[PDB]
Amino acid sequence: ALGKLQDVVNQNAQALNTLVKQLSSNFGAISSVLNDISGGRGGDISGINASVVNIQKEIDRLNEVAKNLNESLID
Amino acid sequence: ALGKLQDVVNQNAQALNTLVKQLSSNFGAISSVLNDISGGRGGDISGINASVVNIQKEIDRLNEVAKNLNESLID
Numbered sequence: 350a351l352g353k354l355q356d357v358v359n360q361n362a363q364a365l366n367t368l369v370k371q372l373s374s375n376f377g378a379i380s381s382v383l384n385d386i387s388g389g390r391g392g393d394i395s396g397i398n399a400s401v402v403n404i405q406k407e408i409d410r411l412n413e414v415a416k417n418l419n420e421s422l423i424d
Numbered sequence: 425a426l427g428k429l430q431d432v433v434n435q436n437a438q439a440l441n442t443l444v445k446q447l448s449s450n451f452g453a454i455s456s457v458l459n460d461i462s463g464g465r466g467g468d469i470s471g472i473n474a475s476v477v478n479i480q481k482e483i484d485r486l487n488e489v490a491k492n493l494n495e496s497l498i499d
Contacts, residue, residue: 351426355497358433362493365440369486376483379454380476386461387473398462401455408451411444411486418437422430 357421361414368414372407375400432496436489443489447482450475 378400386392453475461467 351429354426354429354433358429358493359497362490362497365486365490365493369483369490372483372486376479379458380480383454383469383472383476386467387469392461394458394462397458401458404451405455408444408447411440411447415437415440415444418433418440422434422437 354421357417361417364410365414368407368410372404375403375407379404429496432492436492439485440489443482443485447479450478450482454479 378396382392382394382397453471457467457469457472
């Protein structure tokens with residue numbers, strides 16, 4: 350019980366901290382361009398496709414972290 | 425040790441599962457419009473400001489989950 354769980358928590362907390370940093374950077378780029386478009390200023394979409402790909406991967410990786418944490422209590 | 429930790433894991437796994445579902449829905453809207461704009465088809469930005477606000481809150485909430493998990497091993 351105690352041994353198996355803490356390892357799961359450490360590894361996933363680290364993965365989560367990394368994924369949050371990645372989401373933050375990529376979404377900063379996306380939110381800035383969307384602010385411009387909604388401001389009627391047009392938008393520079395340079396690099397945005399790549400940021401979107403990165404966020405899609407991060408969401409899936411976050412889902413894996415959630416699954417790992419939940420599984421650690423069950424089996 | 426064992427008692428304090430599992431509660432942290434359960435509550436945060438639940439919060440994480442909820443936040444991932446929220447991020448997924450909001451980002452589906454954002455990625456669809458960005459795909460359109462990069463496709464040269466223009467973009468319908470209806471509702472997008474609100475999705476951006478929601479993702480900003482979810483990122484901050486994810487950071488709180490990461491902090492809680494890490495703190496549970498230390499103090």
